[PDB]
Structures are given as structure tokens and as C-alpha cells.
Amino acid sequence: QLADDRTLLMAGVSHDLRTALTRIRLATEMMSEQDGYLAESINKDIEECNAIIEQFID
């Protein structure tokens, strides 16, 4: 009943979060084989962040 203004805001937010998370994914894609379980963890947490944004910020 005050909506579309923070709808736009939230699209901005979603955009900036996704941009930064994508940079993170990019960085993990360059991690070594020894750091595999770490990369895997980080990506699982990125996926989870994106799910949170998708559902409650979209």
C-alpha cells in the first residue's frame, strides 16, 4: 500500500547483490584443487543467497 517505490529499490538491491555474488563465483572458479571443498562450500552459499533474493527480494 506503499509498494512500487521499494519494489524498484529492491530490484536495485537484487542487482547489486547478484553482481557481487557473481564476482565471488568467478573468484572461486580460479581456486586450486586442494581448496575444492572450500570452493564447493562458497558456491553452495552463493546459490543459497540467490535463492533468498529470488524468493523474498523478488
Site residues (vs a second copy, CB under 8 A): 1, 4, 9-10, 12-13, 16-17, 20-21, 23-24, 27-28, 30-32, 34-35, 38, 41-42, 45-46, 48-49, 52-53, 56-57
Minimum Å gap between C-beta 42 and a second copy is 5
Eight-class DSSP state of 33: S
Minimum Å gap between C-beta 40 and a second copy is 9
Instruction: Using alpha carbons, select from 15, 7, 38 the residue that is nearest to residue 30.
Output: 38
* CA–CA distance, 37 with 18 (Å, rounded to integer): 23
- The C-alpha cell of 32 is what? 586450486
